[PDB]
């Protein structure tokens, strides 16, 4: 997380940390608990190549990484079939947990939006994660979960910004309709934040607007953060995750 502060213990109970085996179960991506048996993440974290599940664990909402870990096994990885790369699109995935989580005050699910939700500029949105604090700059120990309020930008406006100082033809779309834009040069998500949630307050409820996907650098001029538009893939998500 570029810019922003350390999250309070209470806030973002749906926040998960994806881990990879090695000298320790290291953090590499984030995700959100959307159901007691399901976690929503970005496809690039776990694909397009097939991954060994022995090499993956999920860690539920805790303030700091590794200090009070209880690693949960994953039973299935479901990557959107249309996914190849982040810039192409469909950078969305689901992890089915081997055991259902017992939801509480500190650990519970995030609400997905209705399809009709557009998430226009002005909305008060926040992105959360344990990723890079700046370009090629890791989050230092004790690894606190970080939060940053990011400004929503319209897709065509964002697309136009992405063309500034680029050879790419103006008629050639960069920000695709399954994507969403948020951030500036001071506030943004970064490498390691991927799969994490972009949540916005809509009529007193936190709805996951987006999934941290990609972007050129971190908090770079005319390069806002690009997130997967959750509304776009609701039907796919709900093919696997119980509606409730």
């Amino acid at each position: 997380i570029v810019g922003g502060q350390e999250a309070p213990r209470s806030k973002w109970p749906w926040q998960v940390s994806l881990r990879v085996h090695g000298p320790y179960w290291m953090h590499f991506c984030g995700g959100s608990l959307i159901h007691p048996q399901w976690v929503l993440t970005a496809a690039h974290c776990v694909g397009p190549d097939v991954k060994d599940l022995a090499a993956l664990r999920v860690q539920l909402r805790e303030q700091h990484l590794y200090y009070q870990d209880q690693l949960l096994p994953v039973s299935r990885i479901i990557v959107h079939p249309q996914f190849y790369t982040a810039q192409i699109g469909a950078d969305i995935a689901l992890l089915e947990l081997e055991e259902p989580v017992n939801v509480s005050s500190h650990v519970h699910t995030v609400t997905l939006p209705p399809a009709s939700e557009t998430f226009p500029p002005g909305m008060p949105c926040w992105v959360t994660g344990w990723g890079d604090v700046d370009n090629d700059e890791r989050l230092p120990p004790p690894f606190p979960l970080k939060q940053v309020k990011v400004p929503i930008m319209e897709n065509h406006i964002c697309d136009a910004k992405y063309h500034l100082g680029a050879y790419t033809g103006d008629d050639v779309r960069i920000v695709r309709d399954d994507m969403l834009c948020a951030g500036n040069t001071r506030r943004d998500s970064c490498q390691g934040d991927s799969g994490g949630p972009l949540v916005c307050k809509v009529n007193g409820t936190w709805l996951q607007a987006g999934v941290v996907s990609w972007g050129e650098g971190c908090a770079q001029p005319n390069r806002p953060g690009i997130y997967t538009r959750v509304t776009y893939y609701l039907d796919w998500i709900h093919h696997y995750v119980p509606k409730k």
Partner: antibody
Amino acid sequence: VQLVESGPGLVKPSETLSLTCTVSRFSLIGYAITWIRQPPGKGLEWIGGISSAATTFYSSWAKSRVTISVDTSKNQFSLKLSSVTAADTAVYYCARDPRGYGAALDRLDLWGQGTLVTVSS
Amino acid sequence: IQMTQSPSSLSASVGDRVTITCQSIKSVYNNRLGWYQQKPGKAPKLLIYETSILTSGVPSRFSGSGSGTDFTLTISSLQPEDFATYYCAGGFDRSGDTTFGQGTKVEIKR
């Protein structure tokens, strides 16, 4: 990488056999340990297991008389089998599920050397 | 137990192709089917896991195939060291419905 079963070789009937599965100079934090037994001349039988998230799963038989636990500080896993009979005389194995499952059997990558437990007066 | 191994025991010459089948009435959960080799007075060894994936170091003569309710362990060219008891083991759910197959004793023919 080594898994080691430790415990009494001889147990008198009606008593409780307590075994420990130790782990040498290797992490084991995100993993699951299951206990398997093998009566002499017979085949493999699952007792139960503990998940990556410290969740216990026990087989159809045993459920009632079996307890599996973790002492992270000691890097140990326990197995406690109460009210033993000569039917419990077997070779006891502890094995690892690298996916940290707890109720799996299909991917027990690391195994202990096995410990013979004889139930006799 | 719901894991039927066939045959219970077999005898084959060195270099012969050996096929051991593991079948169930309920379908395997998530390709959750592994093959074990147990040499006398030794702990079982995982050879094949998740139906077809070969454990590193295990010779290429060992291959696993199948889906749902019918699976097969294949030994393309049987070696004298390959005599052992092979057990398949599968999972039908994530909460306790897992068993072992009765085992198959493979013996070298002379």
